[PDB]
DNA sequence: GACCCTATACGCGGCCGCCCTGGAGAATCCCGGTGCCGAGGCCGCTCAATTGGTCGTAGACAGCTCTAGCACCGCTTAAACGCACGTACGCGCTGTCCCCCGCGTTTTAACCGCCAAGGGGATTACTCCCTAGTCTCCAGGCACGTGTCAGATATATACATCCTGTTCTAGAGC
DNA sequence: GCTCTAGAACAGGATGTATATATCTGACACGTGCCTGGAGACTAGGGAGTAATCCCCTTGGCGGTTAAAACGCGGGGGACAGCGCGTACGTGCGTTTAAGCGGTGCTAGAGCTGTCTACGACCAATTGAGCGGCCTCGGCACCGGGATTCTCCAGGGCGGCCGCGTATAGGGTC
């Protein structure tokens, strides 16, 4: 969370930091598939077909 | 009357709706259709504002992972457009 | 080698028995594949079990107790 | 000689292999297949036989259901093959 | 079970016909919907676009 | 047998759709400036733990033993895997008219700000009836023997569908 | 008007699934021989119920303001298929081939038996920081300003296909 929070430059854990690192880890998202995050949202991934 | 392309900006809206983490549904809405799916259950049952809350990001959630795997099923049918047989079948792929 | 020991026959009778008029060539591979991790998870969580009693042969009941740990609750053993 | 159009030995195989719970899957090289695995996590690892059926048993399900769920991507594609696309969407949707 | 082994001819319940009570019947297919039973196969159902 | 005319394919020039490049309106990111409300740090203070010995014990443990899984012995008949002919289709392109998207406008209800206010979650003083534990045992319950009838494997024969043969009638040709 | 090609539907033969015994090993379940486990009944004190506030907090009522949803509107997008196809499985085979099953050990191992030492909530008691509450402070929310680039119109380069010039082999003629 806190490498993101880097990526994102802000110095706060944010609920979206901590599902950006919930998500981003692979061994943590098999973890923590089945769990909902508040205020999280989603990874920003677009199909390749679907850009221009 | 300069018109983006349509296409274009469904892509910035699923961007700036993916990047953001603010709600979608409105609380009112939500809280009005949770009362009245609850009051065939229980009669005169009241509801905290936590416990909406809660109730609203986690039929958000459900509804845009729904989202995602009825996209990833148009773009394995060929298609870009979302039709109600896709959530259908993501329906009946989890069994529910 | 064992991998290949399962047979596309097999893997044609399975899709049958799913309700499949035709199979693709290429997915006998993916098909085996899937079914190796499928495996290898119910494995590992077999044998995790079977360490924890100090015990060296997998018994039939703490499969079943790993693959309903697994959402895949199995019935008749 | 006598020719069958494709498709009827197809439904034909569906209908014998849907009424009867046969093992379709031999026992040998599942077992075989199964101490592989179980030889890279603990050596000298033994399987009693009834340990080998619910396993196959367990695989066997498992399969027919992701089968069927790749039959039903591809008939939501317009399709009557069913390809490694068809089962990579049924497991992302079911999160395998 | 007895009843699907009544339409099967025969007059001992084996797990094929635990198997078809359980899935042919909605609530206890729901219930077991995440339950797999050893020697039941699955329903015998054709899909519309399969038949000729 | 040699000369001239003619049809056919190869090489070359021209054109147009395809494939790109700037101008500018507008969405999005960095930044100047402010703030205020949420986060970090401090004052009591109040609630769970651990050291000082504990004891019946959940576990641990050497000899044993008892049902059985792995290794390979010939095979035996369900089978699988290499190959050839063909008809089901996967999927690039296809024209288009219906279906979805993008600014404009209005209106429409959501978010917000403050307050009555009456039904509802929390815990303290006290009580109760219903629940853990223990003494004895008997009728419900677990494990071995065994008759046989439900089921499993199988041959033969009957009803049902696919198919190839054939007869008949319609229509083109002389 | 006479001769003759070809499409069309039952007629019988082939093949498939299915009923009917024929039968045969095979375990279903009663009988029995025990057997262990809660039923009956004190002992009683710990958790639940009742209340009893209690507050508290969520429902409703005054709107105000405005982001957003509903209204069609317009041009672009593209979802649902028909054809040719070729191409990748479907469906047959002869051949492997390796899988299914059974008798005889055999000791790895899982309990199993009776035996042996260490081990954790409690017997009673703090105590030291967890947390409620208050003080402070700072960083992203908010408001604009500005830069960068996203990306739709309305102009410049580029290669495939068609028409034409021309070389060349075949046929006609003396």
Known sequence: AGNAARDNKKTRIIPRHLQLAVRNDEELNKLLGRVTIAQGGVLPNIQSVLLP | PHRYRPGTVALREIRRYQKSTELLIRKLPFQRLVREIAQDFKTDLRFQSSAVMALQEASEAYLVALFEDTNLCAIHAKRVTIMPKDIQLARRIRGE | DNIQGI???????????????????????????????????????????????????????????????????????
């Open chain 3, 7 to 77: 047979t596309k026959p097999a893997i044609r009778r399975l899709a049958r028995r799913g309700g499949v008029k035709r199979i693709s060539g290429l997915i006998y591979e993916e098909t085996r594949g899937v079914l190796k991790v499928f495996l290898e998870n119910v494995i590992r969580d077999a044998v995790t079990y079977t360490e924890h009693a100090k015990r060296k042969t997998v018994t039939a009941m703490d499969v079943v107790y790993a693959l309903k740990r697994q959402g895949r609750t199995l019935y008749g053993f």
